[PDB]
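User: Is it possible to get a 3D structure for a protein together with its bound compound? The compound here is zinc ion. I've pasted both below.
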Amino acid sequence: NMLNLLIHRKNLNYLHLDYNFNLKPVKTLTTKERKKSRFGNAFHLCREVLRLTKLVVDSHVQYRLGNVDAFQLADGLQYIFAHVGQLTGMYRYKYKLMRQIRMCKDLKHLIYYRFNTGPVGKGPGCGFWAAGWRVWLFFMRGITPLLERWLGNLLARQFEGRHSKGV
Amino acid sequence: VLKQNPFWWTHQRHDGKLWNLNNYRTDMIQALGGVEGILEHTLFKGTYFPTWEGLFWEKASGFEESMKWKKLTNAQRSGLNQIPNRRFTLWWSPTINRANVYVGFQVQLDLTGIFMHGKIPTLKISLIQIFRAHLWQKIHESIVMDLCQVFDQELDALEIETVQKETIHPRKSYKMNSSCADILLFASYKWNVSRPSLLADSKDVMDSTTTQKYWIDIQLRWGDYDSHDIERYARAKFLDYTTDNMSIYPSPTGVLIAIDLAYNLHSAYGNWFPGSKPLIQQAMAKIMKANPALYVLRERIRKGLQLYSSEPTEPYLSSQNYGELFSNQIIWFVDDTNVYRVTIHKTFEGNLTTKPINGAIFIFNPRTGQLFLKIIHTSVWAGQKRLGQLAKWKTAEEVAALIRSLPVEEQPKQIIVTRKGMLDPLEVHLLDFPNIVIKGSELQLPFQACLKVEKFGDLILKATEPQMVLFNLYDDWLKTISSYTAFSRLILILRALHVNNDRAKVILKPDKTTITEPHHIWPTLTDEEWIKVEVQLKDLILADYGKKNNVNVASLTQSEIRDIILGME
Amino acid sequence: SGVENEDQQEVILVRTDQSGRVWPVNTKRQMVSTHEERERVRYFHDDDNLSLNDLVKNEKMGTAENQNKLFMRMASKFMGKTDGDYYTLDDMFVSKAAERERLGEEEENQRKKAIAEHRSLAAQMEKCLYCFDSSQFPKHLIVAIGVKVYLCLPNVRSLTEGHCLIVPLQHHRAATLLDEDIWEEIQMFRKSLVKMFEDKGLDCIFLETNMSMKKQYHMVYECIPLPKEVGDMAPIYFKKAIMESDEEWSMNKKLIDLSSKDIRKSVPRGLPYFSVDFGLHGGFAHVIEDQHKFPHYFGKEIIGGMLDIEPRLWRKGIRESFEDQRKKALQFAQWWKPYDFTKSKNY
RNA sequence: UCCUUGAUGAUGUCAUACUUAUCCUGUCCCU
Ligand SMILES: O=P(O)(O)O[C@H]1[C@H](OP(=O)(O)O)[C@@H](OP(=O)(O)O)[C@H](OP(=O)(O)O)[C@@H](OP(=O)(O)O)[C@H]1OP(=O)(O)O
Ligand SMILES: [Mg+2]
Ligand SMILES: [Zn+2]
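Assistant: Yes, that's possible. Here is the predicted structure of the complex:
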């Protein structure tokens, strides 16, 4: 609701934010409409963070609906945290996240080799999402002030206005 | 000179080349994997060339030409600086666009089953141009229709009632998540099917009989280097699509067929009912080499790659085929050699000028002996008469209109052409008749010489109105000999007419009491007399070939003599 | 089809492609609607007019460009700037799918292409030395006449003694563009000229230089006799000089061998190919890219260097007396009396 | 019961010559 109230206050009726936080144009845009509707790293960071959380919460919703499993929930969460850079696309709008992404890959190499040891083969079957969970919460610990400042200046420019030659 | 050279210390006019790197190139190929291992990183399979040998690249017709020499304003080369790189980026596209090379969000491409990892600069334009005008949907519904029409002709060999094509929403071809049903079968009593297996498996029929219901699905993927194993893909999509709730099938006892557009691989995984796996094998093998939509795919890929090939073509009639001329099919020879014929004369200024003469289209049956002579009058050449080239198109148009007027019983199965330039117009003008195979001949025939006969020439030169005239060049031969004996006799006669054209007439008419009939072309002889004149015309062919090539005919082997007389070595 | 009455006449409007096939030619942007309810359903303006058989037809008739027509339009001025990411040349190409200006596509194709091709061809025909009914056409350098090809002699000082040419009647621009009936008759003149120069103690080198195939140059098949003590050293010169021709780090692997493959099934229909054949044995061929690092002569220069001739012969020629010195045709015609195969009226 | 100033066949029609939303990339002629 927040992201498309930001869309509808900017009168960008030709954009559409779907329910999985993919922003697509409804029609084919002119040059003026395309320059008007270019967003920045604040909007797309908030949109991709909300994509990651909706992936997590929907995994839990399909567990709570009776659709999936306990074990398949654990392995789905372990995939989500091992593959944020492949499921979301947060890296495009802040690149330093590769530091986190590679780290999760390293943990996936550390855990699986200890997990797939004996009779257990190379199937999916491994939900040990504590490590990737810690890595993506420690990311959020530092991305909270950066995004609060960026979204604050975004809202302040939308509601106060831009100061042309003020600074 | 403002340019700096690194070869400042030598010159090849004086010192020579001083380095040679062909051993380097040779074991560079052998180190990368060989040509076979290199070309699996490429779209070579998507071009569907049989071999790689005579492939020539063609940077002479790209955008870097007459325009882009003097475009000027070098800020042009700021957005359009990646346009020389497009062809390259197309060619190695199964390795640029991998999962394991770009860790990325991996969006789907527009109306395709193509996924683009990352934001490769010119790849998306190339993929839009190759799948221009809804080619995924047309490829999918052309394969569904082909497999249905395969099932529309094998009813009373299997247990059937009626195959039925679902008209589902069109937006299922480019949907990797789930599918619906590409055809539904309707068996008479029951099918004890087998179990799920592959398309290239051997045996083992078994479990439950599942009356009236049988589905196939058709999945078109766009493989990359990492994932183009079509069998593992087919079984994975089967086990995912049959055991989920988003995709619900009529029966649990059907097959899906996976086709990789990038590599031209195909396979299947499902419940095979008896006498269907060796049917679908032959069917899919036929469809992967005759489908007109895959043809547009392949030609658009080659088109975008600008990559050509002399040495392979469609497989000709060249030498070893020719026994297949005399099967139970309707085969035509078409010859347009004498269509646009010209005679040159001098004017009062002295300068030589060109006036046309009436031509003909030579259609011959090599399995009955029936002839179609289409006399092409001068009054269709009112409109160019300086260069020609519309000869090919008027010939193809008249052959197409003749097959159009001809009943469906005598329609050809193969049309075998003497001049290869006709292979492309007929292929256009016979799109109304898809079952006609058009095949070229390396084996050149003397069918131009048939109009050297006085009856044909006096018919053509004195005409003033286009007419279709019928003949039989096997005059009464089929009462005693076979079609191929009569055909080899006719090739001997026409070749001897092409070589000397008068000594053949003297030898075939040595006596006034030897006669010929007005219903027929050649004199009436008993079979011993035919053996005599066949040996004589064989001598006329061989002696003049040896004279034109400074060789003796008493040393030539039987295969060499056959190649001299019948075709060309 | 199209008519276009060129100053009195009638010409059937046709287009040639790369492969030399000749097809009959039948006869503010509004940003159409390249979506639906929220979903994209077509890219260009005519993705629902074309059927599958129509795509097969337009793939066969369609010339081998399809990138160039779009890149010409989106290369021009007043058209923004690719700002790195978020607006590349990819989505610029998606945005340029306008609604072409009421058969303006067929108009530009027909008018540009048909008229341009005809205009160029007419000019070439008018000033062609060959194609009998032309303007220049010496007409006394004719020695032979065949069914479809003829011998000629060059209009200039003629590099060697029995220098001759094998020219077809019509413009055909290549040997790979020839039909088999013309090609088998060029091979008969070739096998007769070899037998004429072999009994005279000479040797034969048959050149075929085919430059860029869109300026419509007439086909001419060289024949340059040089003495046998120099023609046994002739594949060495051409083998050295083909590989020290064209743009280094080329693609197509220079010096195609033609020992038993005889360019008809060696070089694809469409792309330039210099070729040289030594007598009756086929020699070499070189697919030409980069039309500036390869001279339009190239063969008379190698032959003219191994015979130590001045460069005014091979480039630009030296003219002769317009009837008097050009009666080497008289000398050539008494050479080509025993080896004439084009007549039988010699009673 | 007002009110303000002039530059030597013309005028019209038809024909000929000179520049494109539009693009292609270069050769003649005599001793
Ligand atoms: O293809 P491999 O080199 O053998 O590696 C794969 C890959 O892991 P890496 O990313 O570390 O290479 C898979 O993940 P992705 O390919 O999807 O990134 C992973 O499975 P997940 O997808 O579940 O991570 C899989 O693990 P496994 O084979 O145990 O299922 C693992 O193979 P290895 O485990 O043999 O390294
Ligand atoms: Mg700018
Ligand atoms: Zn000409």
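The beta strands of chain C are 14-16, 22-24, 149-152, 164-168, 202-208, 221-227, 256-257, 274-278, 281-286. The first strand of chain C starts at residue 14 and ends at 16.
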